[PDB]
């Protein structure tokens, strides 16, 4: 990060005088594709054996 130092004193304070309304984007997945797998069609083809 940026190497910066904060001026610290026992009788020094910083009171903000202005503000900026910011919007932060967060991406969260909640679901995935629902797949169904059966052995008889996957493991076997068209053979009874």
């Amino acid at each position: 990060g940026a190497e910066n130092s904060v001026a610290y004193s026992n009788n020094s304070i910083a009171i903000p005088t202005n503000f900026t309304i910011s919007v932060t984007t967060e991406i969260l997945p909640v679901s995935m594709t629902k797949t169904s797998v059966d052995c008889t069609m996957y493991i076997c083809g068209d053979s009874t054996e």
């Binding site: 990060g1 940026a2 910066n4 904060v6 001026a7 610290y8």
Partner: protein, 49 residues
Amino acid sequence: CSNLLLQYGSFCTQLNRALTGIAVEQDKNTQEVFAQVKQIYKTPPIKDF
């Protein structure tokens, strides 16, 4: 031994991809905990708190 491994190369692909995902998740875990701030704040030389 390698010639018979082409019959199971897909399995090796899944294993290698799973280990790579585990490693990159382990790398990403440290960034989500310690890298909360993007500015390195220096400790002031005055220790009178």
